[PDB]
Structure formats: C-alpha cells, structure tokens
A = this chain, B = another copy of it.
Amino acid sequence: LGHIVKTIRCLEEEGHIDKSFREDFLTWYSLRATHREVRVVKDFVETFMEDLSSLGQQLVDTFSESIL
C-alpha cells in the first residue's frame, strides 16, 4: 500500500495526474477496488518498482565500472 501511495504522489508531483485523481484513486484502491482490480494495480506498480530497482543496479554498475 505504501508503494501505491508513493507512486501516486510521484505521478501527481510530476504532473501526470491531479489532486482530484490522487484522492479518488487512493480512496477507490483502499475501499472499493475488487480483488482483481487490486491485483491489476499491484502488478503495474510492482513492474515499475522492479524496473526502478534494475535502474539502480545499472547506475551502480556503471559508476563502479568507471572507477574499477
């Protein structure tokens, strides 16, 4: 749930969604999203968090290689 909120705040701060959407989405997610819809959201966010992790590794690897 923390990942969902973080992601949504990031999207808002970058201008991809507005405040109304942040509120509506998070309310829906917590209280009205079905088990299937939650699974859909979680998979999208999970993929994103995995790609972010991978990016971290790539940056760390690039830095390290440059040093030796």
Q: A interface vs B, CB < 8 Å?
A: 6-8, 10-11, 13-14, 16-17, 21, 24-25, 28, 32-34, 37, 40-41, 44-45, 47-49, 51-53, 55-60, 62-63, 66-67
What B residues does A14 contact at CB under 8 A?
A: 6, 49, 52-53, 56
List 13 additional A-B contacts (Cβ < 8 Å) besides A14-B53, A17-B60: A11-B55, A16-B52, A16-B55, A21-B63, A32-B66, A32-B67, A37-B62, A37-B66, A41-B59, A44-B55, A44-B62, A48-B51, A48-B55
Copies in the complex: 2
What B residues does A13 contact at CB under 8 A?
A: 6
